[model samples]
Structure formats: C-alpha cells, structure tokens
Target: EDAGLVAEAEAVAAGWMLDFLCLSLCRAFRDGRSEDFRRTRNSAEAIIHGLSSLTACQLRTIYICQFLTRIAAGKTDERITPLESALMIWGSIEKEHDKLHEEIQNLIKIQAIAVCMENGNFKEAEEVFERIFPFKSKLLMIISQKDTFHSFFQHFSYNHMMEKIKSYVNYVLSEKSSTFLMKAAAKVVESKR
Candidate 1:
C-alpha cells in the first residue's frame, strides 16, 4: 500500500506538471482513505506553503474539488468539510491572489449563492446571480456531470426549486455575448466522454 501510494504521488506530481492541480487532487480522492487525504493535503501545502511560494495567478489551481468529492459522497471523513475546504481555498485567494477586489467578490458571491439556495431564497439568489455568472460557468466547465449535479441539488426539493433553476439556466444562457453557455456546452460534451 505504501508503494502504491508513492507511485500515486509520483503520478500526481507528474500529471500536475502537465495538467492542473485539481485533477491530481481528484486522483488522490479516488483512494478515499485518510492517509490519501493527508498526503494530498501535505502535497498541496508543500507546494504553496506561505504566500511567497506560489504566484497569485496559480492560487485557484490548488484545492477544493477533492473536498467536493467527499461532500458529494456524503463521507464525513475527519479530513475536512466542503465549507471548510471552500473557505481554505478562498482564504488563500483573498490573502495572496492578485486582483483582490474581484477575486474576493467572486468568492463571497459564490458563498452567498449557496446560502440563498440552501434557504430556498430564489429571489435573493438571483440578485447575486449575475455577479457570479462567470464563476458558475467556470464550475460547470470543471465538474458538470450527472452525479455532481445530483449531489449539488440533493438538499433542495422544494416544489418550485427545479423550475426556478431551469428558468435561471435559461436566463444564464441568454447572455450569449459572454459565451458562457458555449463553454459550458463544450464542457458537458467533454464530461460525456
């Protein structure tokens, strides 16, 4: 098992060199063990320890998706909760990233959206919708799949929630000049493969 983990870590480091950090973190999450979680966290910390090690542009390239994997699985691992993971990533973004104002706004907007959705506040949710449209589209580009979508919406089953979401989707897609839906469409196709 140790040998296998070593190999996986090597693979993650090599794969991360070619791709992105999130993919490597997702690979680590596949093992679903506490040791795997620790290794991934340690690897991430090693790479970006202190604000001096990594650049502001590469800040978002760190963690979150792996925590989402745990969240979506409903696994209460002692490692980290989804909200905690989000805050961890956002905290670094706030403290280290360039474009402080917009980046921080984006993070807060996403949090607000989640809180609004959890409370079934569709109107308040929509109020912040436009501000985070780019971030939402980026998330769809990354992890828009059947299981992920189901996991995300599983907590909400209000009678009109689905309808509101559907209507919101149409509204989001109408912003063609932004090409948000175009990227999301391409991502959906990629996810199918």
Candidate 2:
C-alpha cells in the first residue's frame, strides 16, 4: 500500500512537469532561444524517465519524441526566413536518413525557391519551381489552390518587377541612345566642344 501511494504521488508530479514542459516548448518555438529549447527537451526527458515503468505514458513519450524532432527543425535565423530554417533542418535530417515525408520535402523545395528569390536568383527559383510542378498546363489546373504556385508568382513577380525598371533604363541607354537624357547631354557637350 505504501509503494502504491508513492507511485501515485510520482505520477501526479510527472504529469505536472509534462504540462510545464509543453509550455516551455511553446516559448522556445516562439523565442528561438536554444537554451530554452534544450531545457524543454530535457524536461520532457525527465518526465519520461520518471514514468518509464508506466504503460499508458509510453504513448506520450512517442508524442514527446516527435515534438523534439519538429523543434529540432524549427530554429529561425534573423538573417533567413522560416522556410530557410526549415530547409536547414531538413538538410540535417537528410544526412541521417534517405527518406523524408513528402510534405517536409515539398516545404524544403518551396523554401529553396524562396531563398533564391530573396537573393535575386529568379531564374534559379523558376527552375526549382518547374522541377517540382513540372506541368505548365497543370498549373492552370491548380490555379485556384491556396498554397500552390501562388506564393512563387507573388514573390517572383515582385522581384522581377523591380528588375524590369533597371532593364528598361539599360535598354534605353543601349538601343535608344539618341533619346536617352544622359547620352543626349553628352552629345550636346561634344557638339559644343
């Protein structure tokens, strides 16, 4: 009876600790503090240790493992987007295992395109997108899809639009030199001289 009471008390304490562990995990996710993330993971480990002899809590252990894996992939760099962070996580996982979830793989591809776009690599971004969603006609098939190619179109076009202005200026200077203001100014000075 004393052993039974002691086990019950331990169980209650473990449950409370697990709850606190989850709260800390959320904070780690939000703040991206590696120390807090490690603490959260360690707290989960301790709870699992305390309940190692129990059967029902084994399921919760599986959940904690997944949570840690996901958090492992969840760090965001201020210099990079969340997608880049996700890709960094996936890259590490790929080094360990050959197979990855289709969803995660797709997200990594998407973020690769985004990183290219962010760095003014539109041609590379388009190539990456085409590799993933190969059919140009099929793009029309999912034209209305929410998370499909829409973001690519948005970012790619916005980036390209800025490029268009610079390209237009260059074109005028090269092809329409007589009408270009700076060139015309130069010609006027040459004629006066």
Candidate 3:
C-alpha cells in the first residue's frame, strides 16, 4: 500500500480493464458465444460507470465504451444518445488520439442512425449519413440487416425517409462489388504461389 505505488497502479488498472474488454469483445464476435458478448459489454459498462463521476474529463472514453457495449450487443438500447459529448471532446483531443477519437464518434453516430430514423428524425439521420459517408459500409450494413429493418424501418412505409434510404442502397451495391473484386484478385494472387 505504498503511496507512490498506489498512484501508478490506478493508471495501469485502466489499461488492464480495457484489455479485458477488448479480449472479450473479440471472442464474442468470432465465437458468437452469448456469455462472452454479455461479459464484454459488461466490461464496457463497468468502465463507463467508473468514469461517470463529475471529477475527471474522461468524457471521451465514456462514449468509446458506449460504442463498445453497443457493438457487443449488436444494437443500441438508448433512445437518446451522447453525441453531444462525442462532438465536444474531439475539440481537445491530442494529435495521437485523433484517429481513435474520430472512429469512436463514427461508430456511435452510425449506430444512432437507426435510433434517429425510428423516431422520424430523418433530417438528423441524413446529415449524419452525409458527414460519415466513409463509413457507409457500417451505415448500410446496419440498416440492411433484416432484424434492424423490421425493428426500425418497417413502420415507415410511406415516408420520404424510405426514399432517402433507397439512395444509400445504390452505394452499398457498388461498394460490395468492389469488395468482391478485391477478394477474387487476392485469391488469384494466392493461387500463383
């Protein structure tokens, strides 16, 4: 219980906890083990809980854990989201952390695209889609899933949101065709070996 050692351990503890969370998430996504997914999400939630206090400016990582937990669960539970927190923290992020911070924001807002659309906030969803166009793969993947579509879009049959969604599909088809070409090319290269 040395005072100097206590200071260092707490800093190291966060890294240890994050590693466990990442490990469990990898296991769950590959193995499709229900408990592994739940445990992974629980680690994210636990990390989030520890930082929810008013003292530290850990707001960035809190949203990161939010994304991690959301990914592990395969969908979101929040009707409202922490995008405001996500946006604000990027202003002060260090250069080294810029990519990581931006990716976290991308995943969180991409997931929120469904929640926003479900509530007829298509304007927000459209702007989100436009800004995060590079991640249209995740955007298209989220909405293309049968469970996500039935759960979120099935009730909006007559809305212009449906029309807007139709435009995104053209992009998805094109992206997928290119991906298949890459896979086939890779196979050809391997066969030459």
Best by lDDT: 2
lDDT of 3 by residue, 30-148 (tens): 45576877776776666644432422324433443443344443333533344433333433443244544444444445454655566666666656556545345655555544234
Question: What Cα-based lDDT does every candidate model obtain?
Answer: 0.42, 0.49, 0.47
Q: Which regions of candidate 2 are displaced past 4 Å?
A: 52-65, 74-193
In order of lDDT, best first, we have 2, 3, 1
* Candidate 3 clashing pairs, residues 3+ apart or interchain: none
| Candidate 3 regions with alpha-carbon error over 4 angstroms | 47-64, 72-193
RMSD (CA, Å), each prediction: 15.5, 24.6, 14.0
- Candidate 1 TM-score over all chains jointly: 0.28
Worst window of 10 by summed lDDT in candidate 1: 157-166
Better of 1 and 2 by lDDT: 2
Give the higher-TM-score candidate: 1 or 2.
2
lDDT of 1 by residue, 90-182 (tens): 444433344543443344434444544555555545554544456466544323231223433333322223233233224323432224333
Give per-residue CA lDDT, model 2, range 86-130, as digits (tens): 444444431223233343444454454554555665665566556
